[PDB]
Write a protein that binds this DNA or RNA. Structure first.
Ligand SMILES: [Zn+2]
Ligand SMILES: [Zn+2]
Ligand SMILES: [Zn+2]
Ligand SMILES: [Zn+2]
Length: 114
DNA sequence: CCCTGCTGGCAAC
DNA sequence: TTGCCAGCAGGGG
């Protein structure tokens, strides 16, 4: 069980820190500020990612192991991987011929050959 | 406290 | 269309 129950929604947590942090989703409080562009964020880790992706140079990026797409955030590569390079049991037919593929990247690359 | 990964709106192709 | 992005919560220290 988790005793700390949010007074506004159905969220509940085991400790007060996370309930306080969740309450920022209701109050709209943004405690953290980028010292460069003065944008504000709900969490400190979000601000750190903002400064890395917007105000830092020479930042290494993540190449997809199955195509040449380069993606800035590792989690966004996950979304790419789950969308483009994941098995589709029901398959997808080319919109120009009867060829069927089981990953979206294969479908899109084949369709381009027409 | 911080690190990590997921989420859906939204520019930008 | 999909990567960019801040919002967001779980988990470990
Ligand atoms: Zn709530
Ligand atoms: Zn900034
Ligand atoms: Zn790929
Ligand atoms: Zn075809």
């Amino acid at each position: 069980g988790s005793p700390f129950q949010c007074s506004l929604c159905s969220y509940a947590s085991r400790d007060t820190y996370k309930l306080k942090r969740h309450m920022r989703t209701h109050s709209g409080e943004k405690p953290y500020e980028c010292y460069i562009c003065h944008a504000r964020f709900t969490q400190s880790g979000t601000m750190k990612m903002h400064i890395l992706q917007k105000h830092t140079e020479n930042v290494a990026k993540f190449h997809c192991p199955h195509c040449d797409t380069v993606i800035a955030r590792k989690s966004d590569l996950g979304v790419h991987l789950r969308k483009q390079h994941s098995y589709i049991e029901q398959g997808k037919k080319c919109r120009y011929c009867d060829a069927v593929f089981h990953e979206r990247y294969a479908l899109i690359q084949h369709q381009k050959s027409h």
